[PDB]
Design an enzyme around this catalytic site. Structure first.
Site, short mmCIF file in Angstrom:
data_model
loop_
_atom_site.label_atom_id
_atom_site.label_comp_id
_atom_site.label_asym_id
_atom_site.label_seq_id
_atom_site.Cartn_x
_atom_site.Cartn_y
_atom_site.Cartn_z
N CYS F 45 0.82 -1.20 0.00
CA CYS F 45 0.00 0.00 0.00
C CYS F 45 0.85 1.25 0.00
O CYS F 45 0.54 2.22 -0.68
CB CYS F 45 -0.90 0.02 1.23
SG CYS F 45 -1.93 -1.45 1.23
N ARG F 122 -7.65 -4.61 -3.14
CA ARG F 122 -7.08 -3.50 -3.91
C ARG F 122 -8.00 -3.17 -5.08
O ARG F 122 -7.70 -3.43 -6.25
CB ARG F 122 -5.68 -3.85 -4.41
CG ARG F 122 -4.73 -4.29 -3.35
CD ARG F 122 -3.29 -4.50 -3.88
NE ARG F 122 -2.56 -5.04 -2.74
CZ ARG F 122 -2.14 -4.29 -1.73
NH1 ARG F 122 -2.31 -2.97 -1.78
NH2 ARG F 122 -1.56 -4.86 -0.68
#
Lengths: 220, 219, 219, 218, 217, 218, 218, 218, 219
Positions: F45, F122
């Protein structure tokens, strides 16, 4: 309902009285192809020309292992009287059975009743059923319009050829070169039949070509 | 369910190779021969489309609009028409409905699951100038239709309306002869169903206008 | 269900050999003898129709409209009337209802399934000039009716209404004799039920006016 | 509801002027003419019972058991039979059912409310030797039945069964003549419905065998 | 709606290679299942040619490609034949004929505002155990990035093999993705009538066939 | 459910690191790239946020508003943004939604329980200037996204709208080369899940900017 | 959803900064002080965690396992513990539960929507060595707890159990003095909720160990 | 159920030793410390009431109305207050609610059946000048409360409201020392539950102000 | 509901000043006078408890177990018993039920909401040695009971059972005189309902043994 009979599935089963005796359908015709067709009413003219044409072609169907069988909502006694009438007026003996479906039970199974055409008579339905009792093809013509008997024969040839050789048949296919001739007689149209006894008497004086009160022809 | 003779033909709006159609409203004042075919790029269908195209003027002079239908897309329709023009020299002159989600096919009873759960059978419907269904036929996937009988049927129905008469068995408006030649006896090899089989089919020694349409004669 | 004596006769609209009828609206002011017969081209029925026809003036002078009924089509009816005229020299002078879908027959309890699920029995209904059902009989398929008793019943009912009286057992309006001759003793061979049997029936040596009506005498 | 031709006749047990009856158990092997009449001591009914009684041997030689029925009690039935014997010289030779609570009548569709909510109509049923209902007639309260036609109907049904034939319109087994005399033209004055009217009825100059049965000609 | 980390929706279907039972027939192989709206439409053709050209890239990664549309298998074969004739490349992987949209609905491939009759440009990466690993839904207008599909497979296979995660923009070795002038040509929306298809070939575009015409912006 | 291409993006109101947002109402007239990340202070991330931040001007010049999302609070978001600034020298220039109770995540199908019942996957969504969902991707927790492919996708969608065209496979607006270097080959050690392990992780000899982001080569 | 005094503490399984816990089964034979805090990286919470950490040996000598809880992820927890070590030199010596989906929080009545629909209040539960809930307190988001009162409460409950006695108001086990110094008078500025506000907060003249924890006097 | 922090305190009307009360409406504009005690004439309760009484001016200058509550009758309340005055020389200066039918106790979650099905636990609620529940404590029957922590909590909440701040762990408004003396170490003998035992209790050698309140040291 | 005479007294288990009781199982073979009082530390109740206590031997020699009941706790009960002992010199010699949750009171119909929704009224139940309810009284909050009538009632019921007799109006077992003195004429000031009123009550000049029990005479 009413339902479309389904191509490729067993033909709707029934037991009925016919001019040849009782039949258990299509069970009695296993191992034979069947052309089941309906006609609106005994003693009506288009129907007479179709029965004569089928009778004249009876041997063509016989040699193809096809059992012809008619059907209407008329009684079996009307059927026999009508066949007698055809023999008397045309010299032709109907050689195939006619189902007496008085209570429309068979007609309903085959989608033969179209209320805008008639709530009481079948339309001109025809069904080709193979030697395994499977429905293969069907046509629905209206009350006005007689069928094409040679197209029924060609359809049978095509389906039997497809099964035998594992092939499909193109548009306008025939098994051997051939010629379908339509003569001057095939151009005569039919006067709609009288529906009262008085009109039936008057009809015979109207100058048509009438084999009987219900079947009068002319040309266009 | 069976479409009903003598009643308005089931209405629909659809995309076609000629653009959108509002059926049968767009054909008011014209007779309509609506027919279905199982699949673009299949052989019996091609012979039927060529036969209808060659007889297009016969229908035009009878005030009949031909309109075909399958569950294939309009892009596949256009590709198939291009293929027919290239392989047979014939340009399809009538529209083909792209009935992708079978909505029209179901309204006309064209889906017979023992025949195909995905393709229409060879259904054909004669509809008059008032949008009324007049006659219909359902032939199976194996068996091409008789184009001259469709014309004869139209003639018989139009004469009945015009003259207030009925037409007998085997009726025609004038004496005539329907010739079937040696070419009409060739049968069709069932089309290949894999790409590999389509390539191999072209090596089997048949008369093939394309991978999907190979003819032969049978004894 | 059993139609109710003393109540309006079940109303209906039907096709007949004389054209469409609305019952009882069309027959207000007339008495009506409505009767049914199982099937055109069957022998008891033919003898009954000839007997009613021969007595037509007897009914007309009593302000009685005769009307027959079977589940046969008007085309069978007309053909049967034609057959009766040729074989027996009498023109049926009263209408016959074509009760194709048994709708009228069911209103009148004319279908008795152990007799036939398709044919009416030999029901007969006397209906007065106000449309009220006055009397009824149900004879089976085997057994022809007594036409003179139908006339006597009408006379008895009309006399009751006219005079405010009842009529005793075996009442008649004036002394009279009902003659039954040798001709009335002949029985009917049950009609053939296949075309082949109908052809053979005409060769078996009975007294046959046609394939469906052959007579003999008993022992 | 309409009793069904070709089906077993509705079964019942009932009291009669001859004792209890079980239908059809008691009449297996015999034909049965079951008929109803609205009321004891009424005139059309009386003429019908006399006519059936006079023809009793005609029914007996055809293996036919006659049985009548009304909603009246057996005591009224017996009183009426006694009365018929005194006034007409004939003893009713067949049983009459006392269908007090209309249970048999309803099984046979004999109650038609526009005619009467309390009396049966003139219903008649021919039942064969296997208990099967073969034919039926329903005449109204005004109108006496034709006894010779009942006999003819039985002959025709029995001939059909024995010979495997049908019988034409107006069929009879042998040539014959049904004579109707001047006596058969007399009509019936509707019976009085009060005791006072019944006393007066006997003083009005009709041809009266009793207060309830007076005849005249038209 | 298809669930990442769960078994890919099972189905049986007809394809240009014969019947398939999915994903049972592909146990032990990674699978890239993708859909395209319609045979004989131009973006789809460029994607199929790109997948075909990269077939060896997928095969060396133990990846079975399988396409899908709602067209019939006969249309598929005709289209594969057409691509072979017009572009000289033979599609080396099966295409599912999902006639009645049954598989498409299992995979959420039908988006009615896009089309009520065609799938969108859906793509699913499925591992050798039949588990759905990643997915993309592109619209009808927009062709996919085939090298990103290969990178995604490498990233997932590396994650499994090494017990690692892969960062943004990860690749297994240094490399360069070249996009040429040819990759800049846009696609003219295909004709929707036969008349327009004939006219389209006269409009001056670069057309391999009536349905696939390119130009520059 | 599956968010529907061609339909308005699911609407919501949320707290973000830039203040409250009303979505997509506040972004009318702008394209929006909405994307989710499982957890603040996790390594893939971080690399994605740095890559998006480095490409912020590429999105800005295309009229694209980037907006991130995780189920973490705004306080964690701010701490993580501060940490990224100290360790990587870039200040996150776009808002991050704090979707504490997963309400937005569920509207976008971002929760895949076999991946995580608590974190989003995601997910990434391209939304146009009229608030219509145009394209979407769902990558799993292991696998960082391709930021240049997001830019290409935006270019392709904007070109389609502007020119009335479609874009082929591998389309770009002008010839170009996407370079991936040795740095792009480093893989990520899965982050520690206990404090003790996080202390030890910093002593294991990996390339670590912080306890949660350690890289190596394969 | 008030937890019930004298009944087993609501059981749960959860992730923590020390690894998975099965509660209270993993703590059989130990007393447990379970407490919640609204959000990692918020200031009152930081002061409470530091105070508990400094008193870790006091709880340990009383056979008390401290365990915290918030709805933040375990990665946020580890990041926050690292931050506390970096900014204050104190290492949190007890586990923190990551109650991502509020499942444990709801079992303990820790969510009070008018306080927050997303964070727990300052709930604290004393649980004995049999897993029985013994006492509880619920302080609001504004108000840090009194750590010495938690210790006194534990002492009072353990003395009650050991001695079979009750303890009066203000009871302690031995004479003692709780000193509160000038340092204990500093109040906390409510933490910033945007990144921009967090950057500005560091320039506002407070005594700030980090952007989220700024003190002043009133 | 759980009274909700930040929402209006559950409303009720009740009798008190000061007369009828409409709660919390009668105390609008005042902070309220509402607390419960299990039973009049029990020992921990007495020490808590005396401690609250001794601190009455501490609450009064903070605009705090103290109000106690038990399920005892108002007559038992007055008797107990009289007894406390007689035995300790202290006059309770705040009202006590007589909550006979537990209607108020149930609204505040004060009945914990494993503790007692008939008496409240040692619940305490801080309610602000707008009637809003701000904080709450639930101590068990064994364990007297910390009155200075109640004062500190009130100070912390009032400072938070007045200054717009939060207060850290162990916060006090000014430096201070909480002295706990030898007297604060004495434990309480559980009170007798029969009259005979209550008489015997006064002869067992404890430090007893009355039969129900006996102390010793541990 | 109204407890039913001649049926077993409603069973219960309860806490009391003498320890737990299982009712009436613990009292089989003894008569029981179960009575209730609204509240500890109220004045009418105190005068009744002293009167029952002073008459304790009268009940004991008649095999009667006295048992009181209020909704107060045992801790209030014990404090109240201590108070009565200090102010009146009598130690309550019978148990008092602490019916905290009114469960026993409701079984006996002791709660009358217009009197009090929280306190019992002045109910009294005579229960025999078989646990059967024999007689009952319901006096209101204002009105103290007549203890000698309770004794007479027990005697009447025991004599009825023992001798197989009934007892007339005003029956006693032997001649006797019930004397009521000037002390029995003092009325009770309703008890204070606030602490402030309770302090002031002790300064108002009544005859007060404690704040809750002040007497005066009527003028």
């Amino acid at each position: 309902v009413v339902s479309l009979p389904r191509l490729g599935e067993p033909a709707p089963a029934f037991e009925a009285q016919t001019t040849f005796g009782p039949v258990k359908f299509p069970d009695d015709f296993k191992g034979q192809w069947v052309v089941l067709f309906s006609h609106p009413a005994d003693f009506t003219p288009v129907c007479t020309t179709e029965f004569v044409a089928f009778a004249k072609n009876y041997e063509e169907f016989k040699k193809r292992n096809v059992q012809l069988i008619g059907l209407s909502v008329d009684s079996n006694f009307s059927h026999i009287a009508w066949v007698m009438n055809i023999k008397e007026k045309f010299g032709i003996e109907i050689p195939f059975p006619i189902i007496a479906d008085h209570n429309m039970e068979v007609a309903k199974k085959y989608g033969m009743i179209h209320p805008a055409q008639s709530t009481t008579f079948t339309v001109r339905a025809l069904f080709v059923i193979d030697d395994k009792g499977i429905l293969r093809a069907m046509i629905y013509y209206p009350l006005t319009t007689g069928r094409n008997i040679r197209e029924v024969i060609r359809l049978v040839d095509a389906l039997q050829t497809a099964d035998r050789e594992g092939v499909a048949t193109p548009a306008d296919w025939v098994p051997e070169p051939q010629t379908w001739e339509f003569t001057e007689e095939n151009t005569k149209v039919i006067v709609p039949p009288p529906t009262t006894y008085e009109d039936a008497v008057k009809r015979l004086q109207e100058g048509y070509e009438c084999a009987d009160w219900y079947i009068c022809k002319k040309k266009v």
